[PDB]
Each structure stands twice: as C-alpha cells, then as structure tokens.
C-alpha cells in the first residue's frame, strides 16, 4: 500500500470593496433610513437651523445654510477612487488587483510529460514534512513572491484520492495578507479567479469538489 503524498492549497484573496445591494435590500434600506430619521430627537444643526430661522424673522418684523454650502462644495471637491479596477481592464484574469468585491483564488497551468495538468496549487509533501510546512514552502516557492499568508489552523480543509498505488490530495486554507509578486510576466501561467471563474476553469473532479468547500459570499 504505497501512498504518494500530495498537499494542495486553496488560496484566499480577501474582498476589498463592499458589494452593491439587491433591489429588495435597497427598498429595506430606504425604509430603515426613513424610520431612523423619524425616531431621531432634535439635532444641533437642526436646533440651530430652526430656532435661528424663526428668531431672525422675529428680529426683522420687530448659519445652517452656510454650513450646507461649505459641505456641498467640499464634498464636490473630493474625487474618489473608482470601484471597478477590473472590468476596465476586462481582460486580465491573471491580475491580483482584479476583483475588489469578491474573494479570489490562485490557479496555474502545467503540462507534464505524460499528463496535461491544470493545477489549483499542488504540493508534493514528504512524509517527514508536516502538511503545514509543505503547503507554506511550495506556496512561497512556486509563485516566486513575498507573501504574508495568515493560515487559520493546523487543520486541513479537504482531502481527495486519485488511486492507481494510492495517492492523496490534501487541501488547506491560506488567507493572504500582503502579496509581493516578483516578475508578474514570468512564464508560469497563473490565474486570479472568482467563484464564477473557478467553476469554469477547473477541469478535474478533485478540484470540482474543491469548489464545494469554497466560500460563496
């Protein structure tokens, strides 16, 4: 009973920008905005708006507006970073900067002698090396990058057997903190992929059930 031990690691890119709302969540947001402005007792800007507005008319027959103006023009003076840094490029599925709203995962192309392999990153783990250690080592090595990767625990995510011999693919979770990628134009073909892309780009069934422990969001 020979066991060929192969680790594998699911790479998690943290979602950066917030996602937009469903039409219903919009309607609900409206409702809550209205009711929350309703239950609200006085305001400083509003006390000093209304009391002053009513006192000035009384001084004439016998501020809030300036604030509003300054606020409006100062809000218009401020230019904000675009939410879509991906669909303007629209092409790179290989860019790490691509999807700000979603979670992304790393994927590589490998053609070996007897096999055409599309690899969600795969590590060959020596029985002496801990699953952990091999995961991390192959991670930092293969991508040729400086990666601060926050791993959740010493517990492995999912396990898959391609049996000839018998051989195991052990999957793990890495939450990426700060990537520093050396030579983005190096020939190893790596793809930065969302959920919808992970569905399509994954040929094997071992990976097709790796999208099963995927976190949808």
């Amino acid at each position: 009973s020979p066991w060929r031990l192969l680790g594998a690691l699911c790479l998690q890119r943290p979602p950066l920008v917030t996602k937009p709302l469903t039409p219903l969540q919009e309607e609900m947001a409206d409702l809550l905005q209205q009711i929350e402005i309703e239950r609200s007792l006085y305001s400083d800007h509003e006390l000093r708006a209304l009391d002053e507005a009513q006192q000035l008319a009384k001084k004439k027959s016998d501020l809030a507006q300036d604030l509003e103006d300054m606020w409006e023009q100062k809000f218009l003076h401020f230019k904000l970073g675009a939410r879509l840094t991906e669909a303007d490029k629209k092409d790179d599925r290989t860019s790490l900067h691509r999807k700000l709203d979603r979670n992304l995962i790393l994927l590589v192309r490998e053609k070996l002698g007897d096999q055409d392999i599309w690899m969600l990153p795969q590590s060959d783990w020596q029985p002496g090396e801990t699953l952990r250690q091999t995961a991390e080592r192959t991670l930092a090595t293969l991508s040729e990058n400086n990666m601060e990767a926050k791993f959740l625990g010493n517990a492995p995510c999912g396990h898959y057997k391609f049996k000839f011999l018998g051989a195991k693919v052990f999957f793990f979770k890495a939450l990426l903190l700060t990537g520093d990628f050396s030579q983005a134009g190096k020939k190893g073909h790596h793809v930065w992929v969302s959920k919808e892309e992970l569905g399509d780009y994954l040929k094997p069934k071992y990976l097709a059930q790796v999208r099963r422990f995927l976190l949808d969001l």
């Binding site: 943290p14 917030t18 979670n103 959740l152 625990g153 010493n154 517990a155 995510c157 939450l175 976190l215």
Partner: protein
C-alpha cells in the same frame, strides 16, 4: 419514603445546578476562553455585528458566556492645516466564547470574516483581559 419503590420521584436538584484552562490533548483539542473583540465605528453597526455574532454562536452549539461592552474610546482629533475640532467615537463590544475545537475554529473563521460589515474590525484573543 425510603422503603417504598417510589422513593425519589421528588428528586430534582441534580437536574439544575446552582452552586480558566484551555485543554490541548493533541487529538481532542478544547481551547477554552476565546475572546472576540469587535471594534467598529458606528454604534448601530457595532451592535449589528455583535448581535449577529452572538446570534450565530447560539445556533452553532458553541457556548457563549459573557457578552459585554467595553468603555468607549473617544479620540478627539485636532485637525492641523488653522484648527478644526471633530469629536469622534470608537465603540467596542466583546463576545467571549468558552469553548471551541480546531475544526469548528476552521469553520467559525470563514463565516466571521466573510460576513464582516463595511468598516468593521475584528480581534480574536485569549481570556486574560482587565477592566
């Protein structure tokens, strides 16, 4: 009555009991007293995700002991260009979960970080804290 076959029908107090250490055994790993610090800027927002964490934790069969609110840190920010004074308010809630295992941790973390609201900060620690 002691002699009768029915002695102790009335017996109750063992049913309701009216009267720390993490356990790492290497297989069954019980990590006691995990402290979760939610640091958020909005009272409504902090309440929302605190409440959500607690609510979920109840469903997960994970024990929650003490959910309390830590003292508000008010940072008065002097804006230096001419002076501007904007009073600001940081809010902190605490959810203390008394027990956990490695696998339910793995699970827990996902739901936590994924469901994080906009402008919500998370800190997981151990029970030694002082107030």
């Amino acid at each position: 009555y002691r002699s009768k076959p029915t002695h102790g029908i009335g017996r109750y107090k063992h049913l309701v009991k009216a009267q720390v250490r993490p356990i790492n055994l290497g297989t069954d790993y019980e990590y006691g007293v995990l402290n979760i610090h939610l640091i958020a800027y909005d009272m409504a927002l902090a309440e929302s995700y605190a409440q959500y964490v607690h609510n979920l934790c109840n469903h997960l069969a994970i024990k929650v002991e003490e959910s309390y609110a830590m003292p508000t840190k008010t940072m008065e920010v002097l804006q230096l260009q001419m002076f501007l004074d904007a009073v600001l308010t940081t809010h902190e809630r605490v959810v203390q979960i008394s027990g956990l295992s490695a696998t339910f941790a793995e699970i827990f973390l996902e739901i936590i970080h994924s469901n994080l609201p906009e402008g919500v900060k998370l800190s997981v620690r151990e029970h030694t804290e002082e107030d």
